[PDB]
């Protein structure tokens, strides 16, 4: 086994998205192909936009609700995606079933004798599990030449309230995700929860840390192309005063920012070079 390392980077200063790619080329004598371990890190800003505090009856904010990362080779080349991390979780939780029974009797003495009998049956169930603000699962488009991940807003706690998500729906108050007060006597743009109370990934920066393992045929091209995409989906969260109470609504992927970079991989010399970039701004 012989190991060759290099690194490549690519910035979208405009979107505040940045790609750090770390490459480990592995020559393994027991293996008939070239191996490439590729770690994808860096930065994807949430694209968070504060609400206008001057907004009175109606207000809106934008928040980073989902992050998408993908790593791909080309259909015409000999490069396959053979393994990656993290993989989809078959979730585990702990369960406690308790059954209980009490029986008893009482007696008391006066002029006249008195008495009684008490009996009851308790039962219950307790479940124990881990709760995360954002959840990572594989992209449905994953295949033999492509792996992708969706890091999506999952269980978000307002205060003691929640957990809320992108589609939370109360029949009256709608989506209360970032709604501060149902009956607040305040400006709409001041009736959102405090910025600091919002989950880190909604308001700050996502720092991805994904891994992929790619294989390359020795009789293939000396050089091939790998495409890495960093992307953020920004949701429009808005609240409004109907005269009696406050209600909320969340509009998904109302804004999108995507940073796609293609890298030239030199399998022979174990070098890597940024070739092309694509910065796509979508708005609804």
């Amino acid at each position: 086994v012989t190991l060759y390392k290099t690194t490549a980077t690519a910035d979208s200063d405009k979107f505040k998205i940045s790609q750090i790619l770390t490459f480990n080329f592995i020559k393994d004598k027991s293996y008939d192909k070239d191996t490439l371990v590729l770690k994808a890190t860096g930065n994807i800003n949430s694209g968070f936009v504060k609400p206008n505090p001057n907004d009175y009856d109606f207000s809106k904010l934008y928040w980073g609700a989902k992050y998408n990362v993908s790593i791909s080779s080309q259909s015409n080349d000999s490069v396959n995606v053979v393994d990656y991390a993290p993989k989809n979780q078959n979730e585990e939780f702990q369960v406690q079933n308790t059954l209980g029974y009490t029986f008893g009797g009482d007696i008391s003495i006066s002029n006249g004798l008195s008495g009684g009998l008490n009996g009851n049956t308790a039962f219950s169930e307790t479940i124990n599990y881990k709760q995360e603000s954002y959840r990572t699962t594989l992209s449905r488009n994953t295949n033999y030449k492509n792996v992708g991940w969706g890091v999506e807003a999952h269980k978000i706690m307002n205060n003691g309230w929640g957990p809320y998500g992108r589609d939370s729906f109360h029949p009256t108050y709608g989506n209360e995700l970032f709604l501060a007060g149902r009956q607040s006597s305040a400006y709409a743009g001041q009736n959102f929860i405090a910025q600091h109370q919002m989950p880190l990934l909604s308001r700050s920066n996502f720092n991805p840390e994904f891994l992929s393992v790619l294989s390359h045929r020795q009789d293939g091209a000396k050089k091939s192309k790998i495409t890495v995409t960093y992307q953020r989906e920004m949701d429009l969260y808005q609240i409004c005063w109907n005269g009696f109470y406050w209600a909320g609504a969340n509009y998904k992927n109302f804004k999108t920012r995507t940073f796609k970079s293609t890298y030239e991989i030199d399998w022979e010399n174990h070098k890597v070079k940024l070739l092309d970039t694509k910065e796509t701004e979508n708005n609804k």
Partner: protein, 270 residues
């Protein structure tokens, strides 16, 4: 103990299933026969979809994977299955059991005198749950077959069984098909995205009776169907178990035990 590795990867566009297979030829000089460790990995999309019924657009249908299918099989008489993981196991649980008594007395300035007697029993059983349970459904010297089956899910107000007919249905939050069913953040990864299998088989091969064998590796899904519609200002929910069974892709690999060569022979469907 020298290892000779080969890999193969392939996707069925049709079914959205990807086989990522590692083949490790094990040259154990302490061992009587040829040996092969087959590591079966990849990605099987959930293919969870939400649709309006054609004949009845008011009726809303969620199709979702109740079970994931995984198997490895051979016809080569020279080949034996000598090990496989995971295997079926005996379930285990922690139990805590309590028996107690109370004997009370009391006095009051009424004046009165009071007595009391009491007995208590409680039992607590404690155990681990998985979203999906992995079961060996059949195995012999020529192959093994697993089913990864929907088991139990975390929800507000407790755990819910996969066999609960009202599962995933919800009071509609809109007119579209999707709105009649729980959001993504209330779905487990194995339904929201899909399954990443991780299975292993060790295979032996008799010497001097032929160099080539054929392996059939089958990945797939059994889809259930959940129906929801609104009648009389109320929600009617129904469930079809085994709505779409054996939605499977089968890939034939040819293994040359002497040259340590592995080729993809065929794939069905594409």
């Amino acid at each position: 103990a020298e290892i000779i590795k080969r890999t193969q990867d392939i996707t069925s566009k049709r079914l959205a299933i990807t086989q990522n297979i590692q083949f490790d030829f094990v040259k154990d000089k302490k061992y009587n026969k040829d040996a092969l460790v087959v590591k079966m990995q990849g990605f099987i999309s959930s293919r969870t979809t939400y649709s309006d019924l054609k004949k009845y657009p008011y009726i809303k249908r969620m199709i979702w994977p109740f079970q994931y299918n995984i198997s490895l099989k051979t016809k080569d008489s020279n080949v034996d299955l000598i090990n496989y993981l995971p295997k079926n196991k005996i379930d285990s649980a922690d139990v805590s059991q309590k028996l107690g008594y109370n004997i009370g007395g009391n006095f009051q300035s009424a004046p009165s005198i009071g007595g009391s007697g009491s007995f208590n029993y409680s039992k607590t059983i404690s155990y681990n749950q998985k979203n999906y349970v992995t079961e060996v459904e059949s195995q012999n010297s020529k192959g093994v077959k697993w089913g990864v089956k929907a088991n139990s899910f975390v929800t507000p107000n407790g755990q819910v069984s996969a066999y609960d007919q009202y599962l995933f249905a919800q009071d509609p939050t809109g007119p579209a098909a999707r709105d009649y069913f729980v959001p993504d953040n209330q779905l487990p990864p194995l339904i929201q995205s899909g399954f990443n299998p991780s299975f292993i088989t060790t295979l032996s091969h008799e010497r001097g009776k032929g160099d080539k064998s054929e392996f059939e590796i089958t990945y797939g899904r059994n889809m259930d169907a959940t129906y929801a519609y609104v009648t009389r200002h109320r929600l009617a929910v129904d469930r079809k178990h085994d709505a779409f069974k054996n939605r499977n892709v089968t890939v034939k690999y040819e293994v040359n035990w002497k040259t340590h060569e592995v080729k993809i022979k065929s794939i069905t469907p594409k």
